[PDB]
Every structure is written in C-alpha cells, then in structure tokens.
Design a protein around this ligand. Structure first.
Ligand SMILES: CN(C)CCN(C)C
Ligand SMILES: CN(C)CCN(C)C
Ligand SMILES: CN(C)CCN(C)C
Ligand SMILES: CN(C)CCN(C)C
Ligand SMILES: [Cl-]
Ligand SMILES: [Cl-]
Ligand SMILES: [Cl-]
Ligand code: NA
Length: 129
C-alpha cells in the first residue's frame, strides 16, 4: 500500500507515534517519505547482506527475521514480511523499540540526513488530524 501523506500521519497518530520518545509526528512522516516513499511494500538489500523492510525500512540485521541474514537477531520478534503489510502496526511497534535503543531517530540515517534540523511539521501541515 502506498499511503497518502496525511493518511499516514493519521495512522501513525492513532498508533501513538506523535511525540513518542519526544519525536513529533512530522519526524516520523518525514522518515517514512525518504525511507520508502510511503510504500509499505518497499524492500532494499544492504551491503552487509541484511534487508530493510516496509514503510520505515527496518533492517533484518537486528530487528526482524527473514531467514537469510546470517548472525542476525530478531529483536522485534516478527518475520520481516510483517513489516510489509498494508496495516502499519508491526512497523510501528518495532519502530517504538528501535527509537528507544539509545540513539533515538538517528537509528534511521535518512532521518538524520534529510529530516533532522528541518521544519518537519511541514509534513503534517494541512492534514485533518
Ligand atoms: C533506507 N533509506 C536510507 C533509503 C531507502 N531506500 C532507497 C533504500
Ligand atoms: C523513496 N525514498 C527512498 C527516497 C525519497 N522519496 C520519498 C522521493
Ligand atoms: C517539506 N515539504 C516540501 C514537504 C511537505 N509537502 C509534501 C506537503
Ligand atoms: C475533521 N474535522 C472536523 C477536524 C476535527 N479534527 C480531526 C481536527
Ligand atoms: Cl511535527
Ligand atoms: Cl536469519
Ligand atoms: Cl532522543
Ligand atoms: Na534477523
């Protein structure tokens, strides 16, 4: 599923991301835009052999199981394919664990390089929330 901008802000708000670990909603929408273009089915292979999955491009080196990432962990206790659902629940719940891991949203290099320090509230401007 390719979400609309406001559609995804609404879903993320419902799932409790607005100000989660102090990151306002727009940070999450900005991250999703640059990670996946709001596409829940996005997958991208990493140099190390892990893969990133879903709207927030959550990696199989640490967070999910895809059966093909040797030495990896599954700290979200989910199959990586759960992160590809049209329903963002599993991506959200796993993102909550990730952003609590020590480095906040810096865990998403795209957030750090494309959203951090910018006017992230633009990403929810206009939306009925
Ligand atoms: C994961 N971010 C950094 C890029 C998303 N696609 C192009 C892999
Ligand atoms: C899609 N990602 C990987 C890059 C930026 N988009 C949103 C235009
Ligand atoms: C920062 N700006 C360009 C993103 C919000 N738009 C797409 C409504
Ligand atoms: C839906 N319209 C009436 C706005 C109310 N909330 C969502 C801000
Ligand atoms: Cl915001
Ligand atoms: Cl594996
Ligand atoms: Cl933080
Ligand atoms: Na894994």
């Amino acid at each position: 599923k390719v979400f609309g901008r406001c559609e995804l802000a609404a879903a993320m708000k419902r799932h409790g991301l607005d100000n989660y670990r102090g990151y306002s909603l727009g940070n999450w929408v900005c991250a999703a835009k640059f990670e996946s273009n709001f596409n829940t089915q996005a997958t991208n292979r990493n140099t190390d052999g892990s893969t990133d999955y879903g709207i927030l491009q959550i990696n199989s080196r640490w967070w999910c199981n895809d059966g093909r990432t040797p030495g990896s962990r599954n700290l979200c206790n989910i199959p990586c394919s759960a992160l590809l659902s049209s329903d963002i629940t599993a991506s959200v719940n796993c993102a909550k664990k990730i952003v609590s891991d020590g480095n906040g949203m810096n865990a998403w290099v795209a957030w750090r390089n494309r959203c951090k320090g910018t006017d992230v509230q633009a990403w929810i401007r206009g939306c009925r929330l």
